[PDB]
Amino acid sequence: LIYGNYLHLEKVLNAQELQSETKGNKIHDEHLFIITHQAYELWFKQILWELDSVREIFQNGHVRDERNMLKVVSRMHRVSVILKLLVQQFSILETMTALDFNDFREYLSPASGFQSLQFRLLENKIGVLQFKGEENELLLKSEQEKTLLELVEAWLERTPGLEPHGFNFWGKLEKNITRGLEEEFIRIQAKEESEEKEEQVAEFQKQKEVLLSLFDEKRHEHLLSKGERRLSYRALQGALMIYFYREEPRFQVPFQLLTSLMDIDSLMTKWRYNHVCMVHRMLGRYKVFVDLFNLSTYLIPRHWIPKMNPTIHKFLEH
Amino acid sequence: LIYGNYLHLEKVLNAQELQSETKGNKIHDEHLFIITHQAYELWFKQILWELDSVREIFQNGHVRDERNMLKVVSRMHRVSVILKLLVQQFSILETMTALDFNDFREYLSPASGFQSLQFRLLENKIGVLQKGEENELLLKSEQEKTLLELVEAWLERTPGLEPHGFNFWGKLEKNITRGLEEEFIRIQAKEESEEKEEQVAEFQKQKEVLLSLFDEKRHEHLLSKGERRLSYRALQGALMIYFYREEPRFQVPFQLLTSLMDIDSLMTKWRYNHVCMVHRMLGSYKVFVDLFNLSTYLIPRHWIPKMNPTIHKF
Amino acid sequence: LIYGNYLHLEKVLNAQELQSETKGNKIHDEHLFIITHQAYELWFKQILWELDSVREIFQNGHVRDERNMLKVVSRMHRVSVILKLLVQQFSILETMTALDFNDFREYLSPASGFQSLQFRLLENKIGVLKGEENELLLKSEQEKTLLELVEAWLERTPGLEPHGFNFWGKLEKNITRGLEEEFIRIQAKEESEEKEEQVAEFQKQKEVLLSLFDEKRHEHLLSKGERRLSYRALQGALMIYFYREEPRFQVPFQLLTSLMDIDSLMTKWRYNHVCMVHRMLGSRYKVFVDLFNLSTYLIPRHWIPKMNPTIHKFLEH
Amino acid sequence: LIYGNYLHLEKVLNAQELQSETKGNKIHDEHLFIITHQAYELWFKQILWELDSVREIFQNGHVRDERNMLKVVSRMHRVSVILKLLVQQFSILETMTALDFNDFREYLSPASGFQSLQFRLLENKIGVLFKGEENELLLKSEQEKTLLELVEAWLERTPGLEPHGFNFWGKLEKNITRGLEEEFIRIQAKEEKEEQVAEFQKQKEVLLSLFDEKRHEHLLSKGERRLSYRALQGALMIYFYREEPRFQVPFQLLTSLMDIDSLMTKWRYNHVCMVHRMLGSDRYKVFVDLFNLSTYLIPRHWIPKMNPTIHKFL
Ligand SMILES: Clc1cccc(N[C@@H](Cc2ccccc2)c2ccc(Cl)nc2)c1
Ligand SMILES: Clc1cccc(N[C@@H](Cc2ccccc2)c2ccc(Cl)nc2)c1
Ligand SMILES: Clc1cccc(N[C@@H](Cc2ccccc2)c2ccc(Cl)nc2)c1
Ligand SMILES: Clc1cccc(N[C@@H](Cc2ccccc2)c2ccc(Cl)nc2)c1
Ligand SMILES: C[C@](N)(Cc1c[nH]c2ccccc12)C(=O)O
Ligand SMILES: C[C@](N)(Cc1c[nH]c2ccccc12)C(=O)O
Ligand SMILES: C[C@](N)(Cc1c[nH]c2ccccc12)C(=O)O
Ligand SMILES: C[C@](N)(Cc1c[nH]c2ccccc12)C(=O)O
């Protein structure tokens, strides 16, 4: 096949209509405004192409076959890589002054909101809480279909080692944390009645409340309904299982996936931050995977993590 | 206007035809191959949009009005900025393994050459040496004045070159010949040590290079041989801007010359990356060389002719 | 000279002391925490080296000689270039997990604040509102900031003089006459819903455009801290924006553009620092706000006062 | 601990000695020349810290315990991440003109070669084929096992190579010989097509060359290949069965080694460009075999299938 014909450059390179040129006097910098946003759209199509393929692997039960975890992780990594380039793409619009923008602003009258249909589909398909005709069919499908947050949440609940009958990760974790905090209180109370001792008693009482808050299923159920948390309590246990036992072969690639989901999340946030900066330059943590950020910030000592029995060691291996 | 309608996303987001899907079994990674090269093409259209606008400012005599130098420099800077992003865009294809590429390679059979019409137009329009409707644009790119040619014409008009006036080349040759003579006297005075012969050899090598600058005949030979592109009078004008860059009238032209070299090595880095990508998946001469050359003539600061108060106000 | 001796690599490559290793068990990832922050410090030293040299060109009156504007602009550009790399440097710490960080936090107990002396000196020297270090920290607050030195230079902008050109007078006359002519065009339209939306949008934009000429409102915000540049420096900055094409204002426009880049790059670095702190531990102040403000007054091109041939030759090299 | 004391900023921020300032007239831009190369050195120390830790995991037999593969892959990724930043660091020196460089070049007289001890140790420790105290570390780097050597030893232990069980090389040779024969039959059926007959004969020679142990043994001795023939079989096993859980992280490692390799080459390319910019690279890559094995264009269906006994094992 011929390069231009394979890429359909007859459509791609014939979609640049300068509204200034069309409505009278052509403003040169307006071409940049078209090309930059068209390039963002090409990349949003690729991000959606990868996101939907990953979403489908989970939905159609393929993610159960652990062989597919290489494909799942690599595609999510490609999404973060594409998002890193889109964040760098703001440097192109930075070459157009706010003064030069004003010379063509009246020909298109740009709103400051996120007018991209693809970006709204991307936000909905990942799991963002938060006028289009025919496009409202795709937008309704994005809200109705299972989000990546939902599909990951369902998969996280199936994490091995959670079963109370076998291994019982949450039970052993609560036992080691309660016994570890009690052993730390004994070490702190042993010290002299100095001001440095009372600063440690107050800091220990604050950290003890935080550590034990992890086990309050009712507090989590309250935050879930309040919107302050998105993952189910059983999915929190499964995500923490993967974090604490990431070295175990069966949990190595799932850990890369969880790391990748947090990267995509903060990359989406950096892109939105840059969009807002650009809007104000020219005119003047509600993250999908907050639970993953939360579980990684519970400062639990390495030695308090329950040990792995030789029956569980051979089970969490390929 | 509406976002999707203004951007004509009905054409842009409906031009992705996977040859694997069309010819039977759809290969997922093939979509990346389409989108990456389509995005390169959108940026080549923008690069050409800027390059042609700058090329026209020179061709239509607007570059004579010095007020347009902000517009010329800023648009050339935007070209280097876009080129920096295109070099970074290779990281996207780096996320596709050579093994995964092979699974769709047979559906399109990719040649290793630079099959982009826009990139060939970009190369010809800057000044890189040399279907049916597309062949009209490809012929026009070779026939029309290149950016190298338009810059060369403008460089010949640089103030300060006139032999009656300041006579830059004459004073430069006089200070360099006298500076080299003064250095030879200092070097020959030393004892016959190994450190002295290292200085005699290094001086004789630098002397040959410094005086080579004034050999108009040698330059005329290299120009015809293709090893040099700028006319001898344009070399003098470019060096005038380099040596007197601090002077207000030469501040923005210096930024322009700096920018042309940036674009040059960025085009070369993009071509280098293209070759790396081709070998990664299959396995199988700079336009402004004179500007790079003039910036590496290692001429001492004090040998540069001083500026008279009449030339300083000018 | 010898490479390692010239660079003093005997100090540079012998300043990495892992507190985990020294206090018992060595944690591998802790070396990254040292190297990243040391590399930020090397770049802060270079940023300060450039910032102070530019600050001095203004303070010693060299910035008066327009020949020095290439040196001023290029060094400020180098600062933005270095800042772009420091923002990209967050990708290195991103390769260390919050879990691995916990394994060595406790050996150093890191505070979430901006504990860098060099970064505080950089903030103070640009114009952001102990012991031997306290001498440099006091000097940074006492000496003239880059905002102050640029403000003084902006007040000397040619074309502001009321006797000759009178930029602010002609600008107020064209904006007041342009808004009046626009009100006449808007009132002429039929009683449609699109007409009432334009009457409301015009009344809002008219209030904003005329606010530019309210010296009292600006003097109030200046004292409140909500604005930093003097009213005469605002006029000078707007003169450079509107007549940026004019040769004498080409490089000063690049400088003003560069100051805004550095400003939002400093803000992006601070934003990234906050993100990194919350990533590892868990849960506006723009020096040149006036320049951002003057660039977003959406004044039509034709309303800008025209340039007379006497002013054209004056603003030329 | 306190920020500046923890970082030992008393040494770090007091090691900038401008040779121009010390030898008389201080040149401002010379500070950038010091800081850029000092920052490269801080990162080379970190790259070596990671490279040696990974090198040790292989050397001390920890890489046998597959649990350590997350630590191995993530640290090798961190090396590529740091190398990406060092390639981007050339943009800082790009802000210093060749003309401004000349104003301080005489105070240090810079050579065009790679004068970094740390970079030479990095090259030797990966597997690339000053004096005194430094010569002890430089000798140790050549004598100790390289990353190429440690990876080569590990690759020879790849499961599935055993001729009794699975016999990967045997089944691969059988399917490739039968597949090429079936392709020859399809091609010879067409009329005298001639571009496909010539391209088939060339590709057939390349595909079968994979099984010529003698040709590989010759190239290995000649230096044109670095990995042992048994390590090539093991690397190809990981490539073809990358989807298999036990080969997922090893495939990431092999991909990462090639990324580090081409990033080292891009850094060297940029160093050469920078040297020529201020004054007047090729396929000699440590992991050439990994690049080679990834570009053998063997059809997906010719890859031997996986039996349920081998599927549960991997
Ligand atoms: Cl192509 C186009 C057409 C109509 C509006 C926009 N608005 C921009 C925002 C923006 C506004 C003023 C100056 C710079 C940028 C925009 C960008 C991205 C998204 Cl998702 N929505 C919106 C752009
Ligand atoms: Cl979209 C398309 C269609 C047909 C051929 C190519 N060839 C690529 C080169 C390339 C080849 C194999 C693997 C990676 C890259 C190409 C890229 C850019 C240019 Cl200007 N010409 C050519 C691409
Ligand atoms: Cl080298 C060192 C020593 C002691 C504290 C810090 N604090 C970091 C902030 C930070 C905290 C936890 C995890 C990641 C980052 C820091 C970085 C930059 C600055 Cl200016 N101040 C502070 C670092
Ligand atoms: Cl800090 C220092 C001291 C003495 C020599 C070099 N040479 C540079 C090369 C280079 C030469 C001229 C202009 C720009 C760069 C260099 C850089 C990196 C390495 Cl590994 N070796 C060498 C630098
Ligand atoms: C067989 C399985 N894929 C088990 C599973 C689910 N989530 C996981 C996370 C890490 C490791 C394994 C799992 C399944 O039940 O789908
Ligand atoms: C009036 C003029 N623009 C002079 C000119 C030509 N090349 C230059 C370079 C630097 C500064 C000025 C010039 C012209 O002759 O076009
Ligand atoms: C001679 C002068 N540089 C004039 C000056 C002041 N501000 C400016 C802004 C743009 C251009 C020139 C100026 C001076 O007064 O320092
Ligand atoms: C136990 C083992 N790590 C097996 C092994 C060697 N190379 C491999 C590559 C991929 C997967 C496993 C291996 C060893 O022999 O060291």
XYZ file of C-alpha atoms in Angstrom, chain A:
318
model
C 0.000 0.000 0.000
C 1.029 3.677 -0.604
C 1.919 5.787 2.500
C -0.666 8.582 1.964
C -3.383 6.132 0.923
C -2.776 3.788 3.864
C -3.005 6.753 6.285
C -5.981 8.277 4.379
C -4.185 11.623 4.261
C -6.935 12.787 1.831
C -9.216 13.182 4.925
C -6.507 13.914 7.571
C -4.711 16.644 5.639
C -7.945 18.157 4.229
C -9.722 18.906 7.535
C -8.064 22.269 8.320
C -10.643 25.036 7.915
C -9.493 28.384 9.291
C -12.634 30.322 10.371
C -10.753 33.616 9.981
C -9.893 32.787 6.332
C -13.505 31.573 5.717
C -15.063 34.700 7.327
C -12.805 37.214 5.542
C -9.269 37.930 6.789
C -7.070 34.836 7.428
C -5.169 34.897 10.757
C -1.947 32.845 10.463
C -1.705 31.623 14.067
C -5.216 30.114 13.843
C -3.780 27.140 11.894
C -1.796 26.138 15.032
C -5.064 26.173 17.060
C -6.572 23.677 14.590
C -3.530 21.314 14.225
C -2.814 21.090 17.969
C -6.399 20.168 18.903
C -6.690 17.784 15.931
C -3.458 16.032 17.091
C -4.918 15.791 20.645
C -8.009 14.121 19.079
C -5.877 11.587 17.106
C -4.208 10.598 20.389
C -7.524 10.461 22.269
C -8.710 7.977 19.597
C -5.603 5.826 20.238
C -6.042 6.080 24.034
C -9.688 4.980 23.655
C -8.607 2.163 21.281
C -6.260 0.828 24.013
C -8.607 1.534 26.957
C -11.505 -0.288 25.308
C -9.312 -3.297 24.385
C -8.163 -3.568 28.035
C -11.755 -2.994 29.263
C -12.913 -5.845 26.986
C -10.203 -8.303 28.253
C -11.678 -7.873 31.754
C -15.383 -7.882 30.656
C -15.110 -11.042 28.487
C -13.312 -13.026 31.238
C -9.919 -13.172 29.518
C -8.215 -11.367 32.453
C -8.875 -14.662 34.398
C -6.210 -16.315 32.167
C -3.067 -14.788 33.729
C -1.230 -15.044 30.363
C -3.194 -11.910 29.329
C -1.609 -9.784 32.090
C 1.385 -8.910 29.878
C -1.041 -7.558 27.208
C -3.113 -5.712 29.875
C -0.081 -4.060 31.561
C 1.703 -3.100 28.314
C -1.394 -1.466 26.824
C -2.066 0.523 30.004
C 1.606 1.598 29.946
C 1.176 2.733 26.307
C -1.769 4.873 27.499
C 0.472 6.584 30.112
C 3.196 7.062 27.461
C 0.670 8.714 25.072
C -0.627 10.850 27.965
C 2.966 11.962 28.743
C 3.278 13.243 25.129
C -0.088 15.067 25.328
C 1.086 16.845 28.487
C 4.280 17.901 26.571
C 2.052 19.026 23.608
C 1.067 22.128 25.605
C 4.522 23.523 24.644
C 3.265 23.932 21.052
C 0.382 26.252 22.055
C 2.790 28.050 24.419
C 4.500 29.362 21.205
C 1.310 31.393 20.406
C 0.993 34.607 22.437
C -2.247 35.552 24.212
C -2.144 38.759 22.083
C -1.977 36.757 18.772
C -4.777 34.468 20.008
C -7.081 37.509 20.474
C -6.617 38.331 16.753
C -8.585 35.135 15.830
C -10.580 34.454 19.102
C -13.691 36.228 17.737
C -13.943 33.916 14.667
C -14.594 30.768 16.709
C -15.489 32.131 20.233
C -13.893 29.370 22.333
C -15.551 28.117 25.503
C -13.270 27.309 28.477
C -14.869 23.888 29.192
C -13.697 20.449 28.014
C -15.597 20.389 24.674
C -13.949 17.150 23.466
C -16.359 14.242 22.979
C -13.452 11.761 22.951
C -12.036 13.168 26.217
C -15.491 12.887 27.851
C -15.751 9.255 26.595
C -12.183 8.647 27.947
C -13.158 10.096 31.350
C -16.364 7.991 31.509
C -14.648 4.782 30.359
C -11.898 5.108 33.000
C -14.458 5.910 35.739
C -14.606 9.689 36.311
C -17.532 10.654 38.598
C -17.996 14.331 37.418
C -25.060 19.408 23.802
C -24.314 16.533 21.302
C -26.607 14.955 18.628
C -25.863 11.305 17.507
C -22.688 11.638 19.644
C -25.112 11.364 22.680
C -25.536 7.654 21.642
C -21.770 7.044 22.193
C -21.860 9.246 25.341
C -24.821 7.259 26.745
C -23.050 3.958 25.937
C -19.946 5.227 27.843
C -22.023 5.832 30.995
C -24.005 2.566 30.679
C -21.071 0.221 29.922
C -18.766 -1.079 32.691
C -15.994 1.402 33.584
C -12.305 0.374 33.947
C -12.664 1.203 37.688
C -15.630 -1.239 37.887
C -13.861 -4.019 35.925
C -10.645 -3.631 37.981
C -12.753 -3.566 41.214
C -14.420 -6.883 40.231
C -11.020 -8.463 39.397
C -9.464 -7.136 42.648
C -12.174 -8.861 44.705
C -10.983 -12.212 43.151
C -7.358 -11.719 44.397
C -5.975 -14.967 45.860
C -5.145 -15.031 49.583
C -8.180 -13.054 50.768
C -10.312 -16.115 51.654
C -10.821 -16.314 55.434
C -10.730 -20.138 55.282
C -7.296 -20.137 53.525
C -4.488 -17.645 54.425
C -7.009 -15.014 55.706
C -4.931 -11.933 54.814
C -7.193 -9.325 56.470
C -7.396 -11.256 59.731
C -3.649 -11.770 60.052
C -3.038 -8.111 59.004
C -5.427 -6.793 61.697
C -3.834 -9.114 64.303
C -0.270 -7.992 63.428
C -1.216 -4.299 63.322
C -3.114 -4.433 66.665
C -0.222 -6.380 68.288
C 2.391 -4.114 66.660
C 0.667 -0.940 67.857
C 0.368 -2.437 71.373
C 4.115 -3.326 71.313
C 4.891 0.279 70.161
C 2.745 1.783 72.994
C 4.803 -0.326 75.473
C 8.076 1.059 73.966
C 6.750 4.673 74.128
C 5.331 4.451 77.709
C 8.733 3.076 78.903
C 10.488 6.414 78.151
C 11.067 9.172 80.812
C 8.395 11.912 81.348
C 10.236 14.311 78.956
C 8.580 16.687 76.419
C 10.023 14.419 73.625
C 8.059 11.475 75.160
C 4.732 13.377 75.161
C 5.314 14.419 71.514
C 5.667 10.658 70.698
C 2.505 9.720 72.711
C 0.435 12.268 70.719
C 2.011 11.189 67.363
C 1.437 7.497 68.211
C -2.232 8.113 69.103
C -2.725 9.873 65.720
C -0.981 7.062 63.756
C -2.890 4.347 65.712
C -6.246 5.929 64.678
C -5.093 5.960 61.023
C -3.831 2.347 61.005
C -6.971 0.931 62.634
C -9.235 3.066 60.355
C -8.223 0.604 57.547
C -10.295 -2.119 59.305
C -13.454 0.001 59.835
C -15.670 -1.454 57.055
C -18.512 0.879 58.182
C -16.295 4.014 57.783
C -15.316 2.843 54.296
C -18.976 2.131 53.361
C -19.824 5.704 54.488
C -17.050 7.304 52.383
C -17.999 5.103 49.379
C -21.571 6.523 49.484
C -20.226 10.057 50.128
C -18.085 9.707 46.918
C -14.786 10.084 48.872
C -13.863 6.446 47.957
C -14.631 4.338 44.832
C -13.358 0.771 45.363
C -15.391 -1.798 47.291
C -14.051 -2.910 50.684
C -13.185 -6.408 49.294
C -11.326 -4.736 46.359
C -9.306 -2.635 48.891
C -8.220 -5.935 50.543
C -7.241 -7.403 47.164
C -5.303 -4.284 46.125
C -3.420 -4.271 49.472
C -2.701 -8.018 49.008
C -0.990 -7.209 45.662
C 0.914 -4.276 47.243
C 2.253 -6.252 50.238
C 3.066 -9.401 48.236
C 4.204 -7.700 44.979
C 7.421 -9.755 44.937
C 5.373 -13.014 44.599
C 5.388 -14.058 40.935
C 1.590 -14.148 40.435
C 1.368 -10.579 41.863
C 4.342 -9.021 39.974
C 2.501 -7.963 36.793
C -0.785 -7.065 38.704
C 1.395 -4.704 40.806
C 2.704 -3.083 37.596
C -0.956 -2.694 36.485
C -1.961 -1.014 39.786
C 1.092 1.284 39.565
C 0.130 2.058 35.906
C -3.489 2.900 36.848
C -2.212 5.510 39.340
C 0.179 6.950 36.679
C -2.686 7.296 34.158
C -4.800 8.900 36.857
C -2.283 11.615 37.789
C -1.359 12.074 34.073
C -5.070 12.761 33.272
C -5.020 15.256 36.199
C -1.784 16.903 34.880
C -3.381 17.220 31.414
C -6.531 18.814 32.923
C -4.304 21.140 35.066
C -2.447 22.215 31.883
C -5.736 22.749 30.019
C -6.935 25.109 32.774
C -3.591 26.990 32.721
C -3.823 27.351 28.924
C -7.413 28.637 29.102
C -6.423 31.340 31.669
C -3.257 32.115 29.664
C -5.392 32.982 26.562
C -8.597 34.372 28.167
C -7.961 34.977 31.899
C -7.934 14.781 44.201
C -11.181 13.560 42.501
C -9.015 10.805 40.834
C -10.698 7.554 39.664
C -8.187 5.322 41.522
C -7.972 7.326 44.786
C -8.134 4.036 46.730
C -4.900 2.834 45.138
C -3.174 6.097 46.163
C -4.682 5.643 49.663
C -3.592 2.004 50.122
C -0.024 2.879 49.050
C 0.166 5.663 51.725
C -0.758 3.470 54.784
C 2.657 3.622 56.478
C 2.617 -0.018 57.771
C 6.028 -1.421 58.862
C 7.545 -4.138 56.615
C 7.847 -6.610 59.536
C 4.140 -6.238 60.491
C 3.133 -7.695 57.069
C 1.953 -11.300 57.636
C 4.506 -13.924 56.533
C 3.873 -16.302 53.615
C 3.369 -20.060 54.325
C 5.016 -22.583 51.892
C 1.529 -23.696 50.701
C 0.613 -20.046 49.812
C 4.142 -19.467 48.291
C 3.711 -22.290 45.692
C 0.090 -21.155 44.988
C 1.136 -17.538 44.198
C 3.726 -18.773 41.633
C 3.447 -19.548 37.876
